[model samples]
Each structure stands twice: as structure tokens, then as C-alpha cells.
Target: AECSVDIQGNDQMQFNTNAITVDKSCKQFTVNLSHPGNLPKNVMGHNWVLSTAADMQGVVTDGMASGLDKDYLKPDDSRVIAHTKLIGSGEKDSVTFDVSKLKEGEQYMFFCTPPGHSALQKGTLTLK
Candidate 1:
């Protein structure tokens, strides 16, 4: 869907959907997350975070200091376009953002920032 997208994260340390297409006509959009794994968050938590590829490493680096209570994300990091809260097995979270912020030629990334999650749990979202 142009206005919303459904993504999944499991204990495998992976996401079911990567590379989303955000239509140009959308004024805003939402990212919905689902976790089907059977583990407590402390052991296997996940969340969605968004930013430019250039801003990604810094955001994830800073997020690590925020701890789990803050969803493993830095407090009010402006570089973050939008994000969802950290969740565990059978849980869900979502975030809606202004579509105008997505630049056409720029590359955007979506990933999980829990401890060591970003390495394999990252993807791209393209503006169309």
C-alpha cells in the first residue's frame, strides 16, 4: 500500500519485508511492525527506525546508550524520520510520518537498533 506498509520481525533476526515503495502522492505514510517470535523482549526484542543511510550509523551508535526502556533509540533524534517502539514476541508497533520529508534521490534506511540487530535487520525504503 502507498499509505501504509506491514513489516515483520522474528527470532531469526530478520524482517519479512524490506525495500518499501512510498508513492509520491502520499502526504503521509505509516510503517506497521509485527513480531511473531516466541521470546521475551530482553532476549529478542525488535523495533523500526528510519533515517538517511549517511545518518544511520550515528543514530544506531547513539541509540545504544539509551537502553531498552527508550526502545533503544536516542531521545528525539532529529535525523530519525520516524520510528516504532521496541517490541517482543506477538507484539506490534507503528509510526506515521510526513511523506514530504522523503527526498527523491536520497537513500533512506529502516532498521532494528537493539544491541546487535542492525547488521542483518536493515533495509531500504524508496520514494516513488
Candidate 2:
């Protein structure tokens, strides 16, 4: 089974892919996120956060308040299954999490929590 994925974030607040598939056979999964934009982290940073689709909006809202120091994620946010550190132009970050934490038939989402960026920089995840 495939155990990893590579995704790119650009200056326009968009991700290269809108969906990801996880194979249940894998014990762990890794997401390698890259920011290919030219802007600085303060202006256009991006991070990958995983959560249930139902929790996406709330996570984003709370994460925005958490600020860059915390990778734009709320400290100890129970809803966040996994996440990567914020990345700036030409920067890359990765996150790995146990696949057992995810359940089959549940919907998950991956998104960038940069202020006002979630609307455009998000994707769905499916485990099979």
C-alpha cells in the first residue's frame, strides 16, 4: 500500500490536489507538504492539518487564533488528527500519524489554516 503523499501549495492559496486516498493496510501515513509560492511565511504560509470534515471550519477558526508560533494550530486540539509545521516559499514540511487513529467509512479533510486560506487550500481524504 502507498504510505505517503506529496502536495504543493501555491501563491494563489490553492493546493495541487483536492483529495487524498489512504490505504488501510499501512500502519502509518505521511504527508509531505510543500509551499512553492514566492511569498514570505507571514503573508502566505501554509500548513497541512487533518481532521474530520465536520470539524474543518471550527478547526480553521480556532487555529487562526493560535498564530504562526503554534503552526497555526490550536495547542492540544483534539480534533486535529495530524499536522505539519507552517512553511514559507520554497519550504517543505511533513507530518506522520498512526493509521489506526483513522477509521474506515469516515470522512477526513486536509487543509491549510493560514488566515483566510482554508476556503481555497483544503482537500478531502478517504481511507480504504
Candidate 3:
């Protein structure tokens, strides 16, 4: 997985990894998400959203207004560095972003944007 990461979200409302380090040499980095539980989207929906640590709250807040139909994210939001579609159990998704979008050593945040999921389903992304 030199250029990609595979993460999981489950019924427990948690992500399998809390930190993802992207190597500086990569041209493109990818995030792969999977849900292993049996919950349906409406009850336990989850998606991977990334942004600067300072912009996390703002992104989540706006995503709340966009709702599930929009993948719980604002349309064409410049603050979003990368994201995967919201999915339920037995589902998976992936997103790829240019490595240039990340600042070396800067701390970024990745989280789920469902109404209350961000409370626990959050983690750090850093360019290493």
C-alpha cells in the first residue's frame, strides 16, 4: 500500500485506523473505505472526508445541511481535500487525491460526517 490506505468503518461507529501517513514521494494517494457491519445506510451511514484540522468542524457543519443525498458534503466545497461516498455495511468506496495537495508535516483530519458520527469516527492524516 505504498500509495494507498484501506480503512474500515463498522457498526460500532469507529474507524479501524486513527492515523494515515502519506509518503512524500507519492504522486497520488488513495483512500479506500469499507464497512464490515450489517447496518443500513440510514442507520449507520459513514463516509471518509478530509480537510485541514481547523476546517473539520466547518466542513461537517455544512455537510449536515447537504444531507445524505449529497453524501453529507457540500457540493464543490473547496475546503474538502478528498472524500469517499457515504456507504453502509457490505459496501466500499475509494478516493484519490494528488500528493501535492498536502503540505509536508502539516496535520490534516479525516472523519465521518453523519449527524453524530464525527464524534468518534475521526483521525489524522499527515504527509510524511
Candidate 4:
């Protein structure tokens, strides 16, 4: 069976998992993100952003400038392979991207861009 991954973000600027596996056979992969804290978006917001490891720093920098209204991401950024809208406590979001987006031996990462959360709320994504 194909697999889906569950990731959680909390008020502490942390993600529940630091690694994810995408099956080579999957036509599509889904990343389910949940924020279980009680803080509002401006305080402890979170979102899942996907990009190559090399592009992460640039993506986050541009995203911070883009601000929350754009989900803290650069609008229409091709570097972003996939991403979920920003969400706060008790909210959830998900993003599905084509499996072909991943290539063998390439490095990918998912991270949060809520001002300071990116320091800790990041993870590696791998295709196997």
C-alpha cells in the first residue's frame, strides 16, 4: 500500500518527526500537518514547506519577507516543490505533490517559516 506521512507542529517550534520516506512507487505523496497548540497564527503559527536542501535558506529568507498573508512563503516560488498554508492552533493543513518531483540521491527538506520556527521545525525528506 502507498503511504502517507503525519507531521505535527506545536507552540514550542518543533516538529514531531525529522525524517520522512517517500516510496518510489507512489504516484503522489501527501504531507499532513497539524498544529495542536492554542496560540494564534501571529504568535505560534506553522506551515510545511518543501524544497531541496540547497534551496532551503534562500526560500526561507524570501518567505520571511513575503510575510504571513502569503503563508510566509515567496509567492509562486518554483523552488518550493510543495507547501501547506499557514495554520495556527487547532488547525490542520496538507499538501500533495507528484512523486516525480523527487529524484534518487537528491536531498529535500520540509520546514516551518513562521519567523523563528525554521530554526527547529525542519526535516529531511527522502525518496526510496
Candidate 5:
């Protein structure tokens, strides 16, 4: 995919990579997330969420209260720049956002929204 990045989440509550770089030439960027483990959505589900590093905690807190049915994220939360649906093993999802929405020099981060998944599945995202 020209303007997309592919990432994976496994049963161990981890993302295969911890960093993403978006090219400035890309008018829009996409995040493609997949679950490669054997677990089902109910127990070990995973979703990709993006936000400013400072907003990660708040987003996660509100997301936790929102529940799994809501993909562990607050509905229409402005703090969330982009996100993928909760997915189970062998499933995948993607999210695309305009590159113009990103501010230069801001600290952006991506993470899984499951109750405690972010501890190990969080990563940094930068624009180049």
C-alpha cells in the first residue's frame, strides 16, 4: 500500500513494531492492523488507536469505560486522530486519516485499547 502501514497484534499482547514514520508526501495515511494469534475477539481482542502522547492516558481511561463493544474507545472522541475496529485472531482492520491533520513536531503515538494492552503495545509515530 503506497500510503499505508501494516501492523500486527498477537496473543501475547504485543504489536510487532513500535514505530511508524509517515512520509510528508502522503496526502493521507492509513494504518492496517491485523491479529495473528488464535484468540477470539472477546478475550484477547485488539484495536489500533492513535492520539497525542499526552492524550493517550485520557483516551485509554475513557475508552476502558466505554467497553469492548465500543472497541474500547470513546465514540467520536476528538482526541483520537484515527483508529481501527477491535479485531480477533485472523481478522484485520484499517483506518485512514488526512496527513494535514497532524501537526509538525507533535508527539504522536499509537496503541491498543484493550484494558491493559497499551502497556506493551504502545508505539511512537512520526511524520517525515
Candidate 6:
């Protein structure tokens, strides 16, 4: 069996899933993201970023400071647990992470760090 999930990003600044819960019995997990809109990445691009809930806010702010070449994420930032490439219009991407990258009792979130985008583009990731 495979451990994979699909997520949708739309022109309305939204992600279909607000929270994802993964079972510890699974050693790996994957998230497939796709944008169905016609807008370009520069305008309404979207990507999935994973990190501890506490680290999310800071990482997002720094992402805007890190520039697009770095995919809006800081270089060598340890807080980032996983991420997908910034994609747009008909574009699709995915990322798989070790379940170990997540803490058992810690809270996690998946979000888009595109400048001011995280506000409406974030979701919870739960591990048990």
C-alpha cells in the first residue's frame, strides 16, 4: 500500500484540506499538490511548506526575505521539514517526508510561504 495524499490549491487563495492526520504506523508520507487556475506563479503561485507550528510564522517571514531563487525559503534553514517547488497554473508537484521528521507530540503545519500568503494558505499536520 502507498501513503500518499492529494491537495488542491486554487485561485481563491485556498487549500482544500485544513488538517491532515498521519498514523505513526506509516513510516513515510507524500503530498501531491496541484493548481488548477490559469494564473502565473509570480501572481498567485503556491507551494507546500512543512515545519513545526512554532517555527511557521518566522520561517514564512524569512521566506519572503530569502528571495525567489531560493524558492522563498531560507538557505540551510533547519526548521523546514519538507516542501514542494513553487508552482502555478496547471502545474503540479509533490514531496515525501520521513515520519520521523515530525515529532509525535508536537504540532505541525503545512503552508505556502509566498509573502503574505500563509494567512489563508495554511493547514495542520498531525502525527500520532
TM-score, per-candidate, Cα-based: 0.95, 0.94, 0.96, 0.96, 0.97, 0.94
> How do the residues 1-128 of candidate 6 rate in per-residue lDDT, one tens digit apiece?
25767998888888988898787877888999999888988788889999989999888989989988787888877899989999987999999989887866888999998888899999899885
The residue ranges of model 4 lying beyond 4 angstroms of the native Cα positions read none
Where is model 5 poorest over a 10-residue stretch in terms of lDDT? 1-10
lDDT of each model, Cα atoms only?
0.90, 0.90, 0.92, 0.90, 0.92, 0.87
What is the C-alpha lDDT profile of model 2 across 1-128, one tens digit per residue? 26999999888898999998888788999999898869988889899999999999999999999988987889999999999988999999988999998877788999999888988999898887
Backbone clashes in model 4, listed as residue pairs:
none
| Clashing residue pairs found in predicted model 5 | none
Which residues of candidate 1, in runs, are more than 4 Å off? none
RMSD of each: 1.0, 1.3, 1.0, 1.1, 0.9, 1.3
Q: Which candidate wins on TM-score?
A: 5
Question: Per-residue lDDT for 47 in model 4?
Answer: 95
Of the pair 1 and 5, which is ahead by lDDT?
Answer: 5
Taking all chains together, the TM-score of candidate 4 against the true structure is 0.96
**Candidate 5 vs candidate 6, lDDT winner:** 5
Candidate 2: segments with Cα more than 4 A from true spot = none
Q: How much is the lDDT of residue 78 in candidate 1?
A: 94
| lDDT (Cα, tens digit) per residue for candidate 3, span 1-128 | 97999999999999999898888899999999999989998899899999999999999999999987998899998999999999999999999999899876667999999988999999999888
lDDT of 4 by residue, 1-128 (tens): 25679889998889999988888889999988999979998889999999999999889999999997898999999999999999999999988999998877789999998787889998899888
The residue pairs in collision within model 3 are: none
